Structure formats: C-alpha cells, structure tokens
Symmetry: C3
Subunit: 63 residues, 3 copies
C-alpha cells in the first residue's frame, strides 16, 4: 500500500539528484580538461626556458 | 500493485545515493579549491625566483 | 494508487544513476591519485635541479 503522494516524494528527490549528477559530471570533466591544458602549457614553458638556458651555456663558453 | 517493502527498498537505495552525492560534491569542491591554492602559490614562486634571477643578471654585468 | 510500471520506471532511472555515481567516484578518485603523483614528481624535480644549481654556484666561485 503505497500512495501516489508517497511515491511522488521519492520521484522529486530523484529528479533533484539527477540534476546534481549532471552538474557534478560537468564539473569533474572541466577539471580534467583544465588539468590537461595546464600540463600542455607546462611542457611548452619548460622547453622554451630550456632553450634560453642552452643560449646562456653557449654564450658563457664562446661569447 | 507495489508493496511498501518494495518501495522502501528503493527509498533506502536513494538515501545511500544521496549520501554518496554529498560526499562527491565535497570532494570535487575540495579539489577545485586546492588547485587554486596551488596555482596562486605557483605564480608567486615564479615571481620570487624571477626577482632573484634579475639580481644575478645585474650582478653579472655590474658587480 | 501506484502501478508497477510507474514504479519500475523510477527503479530504472535509479539504476542508471547508481551506475553514473560509480563512474564519477572512480573519476574523481583517479584525479586525486594523479594529482599526488604529479606533486611528488614535482618536489623531486625541484630538488634535482636545485642540486645542479648548487653545483653551478660552487664551480662559479672555485672552478
């Protein structure tokens, strides 16, 4: 013996949970895409600075 | 024809899921606040080291 | 008055949500373990480069 109102209460909770899960998935996904934008930016930065240091080494010895 | 016990089983599953969603939201949020504490700390670190390098350049040329 | 079919519809939604929550938990957890693998790798890298710089300082003054 379960009434519609009892049932509807559970449906509304599930509706809000489904909306929270949508938001959470979007948030975790954005974290993951941002962490890779950061990782890519980092490797490039270390290479660019690496090339400047190659230049300091060459000038120190031959300049 | 749905019995209370059938229904109650679904309510208990939803209760545990709601608790998992609370924990997940707290976890994702902590990740995001920590990543910004890290990002801020990083920019400061690069600036502080940048100022020491400015000092090496000045001393190398005028010391 | 709630029919099994009405109820079953909510059970299937809850089943898919439970599967999404499992996936989300695995994803957030992997983010957290990866961020620590990265943090550990970083401290080691700064120490190793720190030791090379100690070497440049010593050679500059005594070489």
């Amino acid at each position: 013996g379960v009434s519609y109102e009892e049932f509807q209460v559970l449906v509304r909770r599930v509706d809000r949970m489904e909306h929270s899960i949508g938001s959470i998935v979007s948030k975790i996904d954005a974290v993951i895409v941002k962490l890779e934008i950061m990782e890519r930016a980092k490797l490039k930065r270390r290479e660019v600075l690496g090339r400047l240091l190659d230049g300091v080494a060459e000038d120190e010895r031959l300049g």
